[PDB]
Every structure is written in structure tokens, then in C-alpha cells.
Amino acid sequence: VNPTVFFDIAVDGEPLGRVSFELFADKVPKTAENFRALSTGEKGFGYKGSCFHRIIPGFMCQGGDFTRHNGTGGKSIYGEKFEDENFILKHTGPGILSMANAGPNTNGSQFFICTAKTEWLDGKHVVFGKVKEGMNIVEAMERFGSRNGKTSKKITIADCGQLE
After folding, report:
1. Which domain holds residue 30?
2. Is 143 among the catalytic positions?
3. Is the dihedral of CA 145, 142, 56, 86 positive or negative?
4. Residue 79's domain is classified under what CATH number?
5. Three-state secondary structure call for residue 137
6. Catalytic annotation on 54?
7. In UniProt terms, what is the effect of altering residue 120 to E?
8. Of residues 2, 45, 101, 162, which has the active-site annotation?
9. What is the DSSP letter of 52?
10. Which position among 111, 121, 128, 144 bears the catalytic label?
11. Which long-range contacts (CB under 8 A, 24 or more apart) does 29-34 make?
12. Is 7 a catalytic residue?
């Protein structure tokens, strides 16, 4: 019953592969629905064509800024920001999908895929999904990152949508 969303990842325009995410709509329905709708683009905007602007190997891949492409922008389907829904789920290891924010109750569209256990984020970032297929593609993306987060090539979501 939990939706599955896919991204097709491209590196400087060249196809890399597909990642699919289970979203935990049963635990965080409002947060999961935001990501789902942004992935299908059904509201008229969303993730298709946007980039991963910050990739730190051994930490995380961050994306979702589809308005300024650098970590300053993005917006949710509910408005510019929405609240922290709950903190039931924890950052338990690689593959966790969690919301980026700028303080309490400022979720927009930016998210990060964890590539390590990041327990110090528990209770501050809302966990809402996990990689289902294609963790190996996330691992491949991670190699184009750097210590300060700058990417050596442009990593883009060439296509995205809902599978299940």
C-alpha cells in the first residue's frame, strides 16, 4: 500500500541507472505525499530535470532544489514550508530518505539519501522513505561527490514518477 517512486539518474546527460524508493505513507502520510506528488509532477511542478547539488561521500546525497538548483530554493505542495510531521523513524543506515530543513518546521522539497548511519539527525530531520532498488546506483552517484559537497559532474533526475 506504500507508494513506490522512481528516479532515473543521469550524469552529464548520460544515463546512469534507476533508483526506486519505498515511501512510508503509513507512518508519515503528509511528508510522503509531498515527495510522491513532486515525483509525478501532477501539481504542475516537481523534481523532473532537477539536480543533486550536494554529495558528500560516506555521508549523503542531497537534492530537491528545483527552483534555484543550489540548496537555497524548492517548495512543497503545501506551500513554501510545512511542519515536522513526527520523528517515529530513525536514521538507521544507508538508504534512508530524510527531509532537509533550516530549523524546526521548515520542510520544503529538499531531501537527502543517507549513505551512512546518521543517528545525530534523529529527532531533527523527518525520515519518510528508504531505497528499495538501486542502492548500487546511489553508491555510483556518491563517487562524483567530494568532501565539501561539490559534484564533479552534473547529476540530474532525468525522469521520475510512480511505480506502485
Report:
1. 1-164
2. no
3. positive
4. 2.40.100.10
5. helix
6. yes
7. Loss of peptidyl-prolyl cis-trans isomerase activity
8. 101
9. E
10. 121
11. 29/85, 30/78, 30/82, 30/85, 31/82, 31/85, 31/99, 31/107, 31/126, 31/128, 32/2, 32/3, 32/128, 32/129, 33/77, 34/76, 34/77, 34/78, 34/82, 34/107, 34/109
12. no
Catalytic residue from among 59, 69, 87, 162: 59
Reply yes or no on whether 21 is catalytic: no
Query: Looking at 62, 66, 97, 128, which residue is catalytic?
Result: 62
Resolution in A: 1.7
Q: Find out whether 65 and 53 touch, Cβ atoms under 8 Å.
A: yes
Whether 7 and 17 have beta carbons less than 8 Å apart is answered as no
Total domains present in the chain:
1
Is 35:129 a contact under the CB 8 Å cutoff? yes
Specify the length of the chain in residues: 164
Q: CA–CA separation, 73 vs 107, rounded Å?
A: 11
